[PDB]
Amino acid sequence: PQITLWQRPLVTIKIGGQLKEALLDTGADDTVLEEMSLPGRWKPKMIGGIGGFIKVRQYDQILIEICGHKAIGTVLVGPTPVNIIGRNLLTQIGCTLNF
Amino acid sequence: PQITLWQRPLVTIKIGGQLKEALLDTGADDTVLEEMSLPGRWKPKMIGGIGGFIKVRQYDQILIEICGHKAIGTVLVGPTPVNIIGRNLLTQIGCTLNF
Numbered sequence A, B: 001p002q003i004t005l006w007q008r009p010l011v012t013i014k015i016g017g018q019l020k021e022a023l024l025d026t027g028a029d030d031t032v033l034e035e036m037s038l039p040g041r042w043k044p045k046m047i048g049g050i051g052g053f054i055k056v057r058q059y060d061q062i063l064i065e066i067c068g069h070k071a072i073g074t075v076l077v078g079p080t081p082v083n084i085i086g087r088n089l090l091t092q093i094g095c096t097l098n099f
């Protein structure tokens, strides 16, 4: 679909058997999700945003369905205020910016 | 133009007589620029991102040229790591996400 930006570009994602709402964020290199139930191994990692840094658990090759489109990639889980879908997954579903 | 997301969506903006590079950020409600020389009056404000909160200065009805498209709106100036063009200005240049 084509999404305009008058409202936050929130979409429905399915990950780890669960349904959640997430923000399509072109300004994020990574995908960061609020604390959640994910199976598998994971390695520590620190990331930065406006505000400072947070520590997150890095999960690789995680299946995620974004607005019906499937993608497999790195997902980070930590103290983020909102679920953020970053460029690592946005490219996977062929998402572009247009004006 | 159409912008893919394999690389950060960095564009040239002209604001306050100066040329700068900024990130098109669909995940930002506001436009936040690194410390810069801007004329006029401004109000204090606090904003949050992933990481925490920063104090910035709020300038209204400021003229900004984004990739050649002009727009007038609120711009915030503070301790941000990168210049961020948020939805308040992205809607003005008719920018949309597509997939």
Ligand SMILES: CC(C)(C)OC(=O)N[C@@H](Cc1ccccc1)[C@@H](O)CN[C@@H](Cc1ccccc1)C(=O)N[C@@H](CCC(=O)O)C(=O)N[C@@H](Cc1ccccc1)C(N)=O
Residues within 6 Å of the ligand: A025, A026, A027, A028, A029, A030, A031, A032, A047, A048, A049, A050, A080, A081, A082, A084, A086, B025, B027, B028, B029, B030, B031, B032, B046, B047, B048, B049, B050, B051, B081, B082, B086
């Ligand atoms: C997510 C991560 C992988 C860590 O990348 C970034 O932080 N990327 C940021 C760009 C960047 C690149 C390189 C280095 C540094 C920063 C930006 O795209 C992040 N987009 C969202 C991510 C986010 C949203 C919500 C919560 C936490 C984090 C954002 O900060 N949005 C801010 C942008 C600044 C602004 O608009 O003022 C925003 O809209 N903040 C709102 C909403 C809000 C309220 C309270 C807390 C947090 C957020 C606000 N008015 O404060």
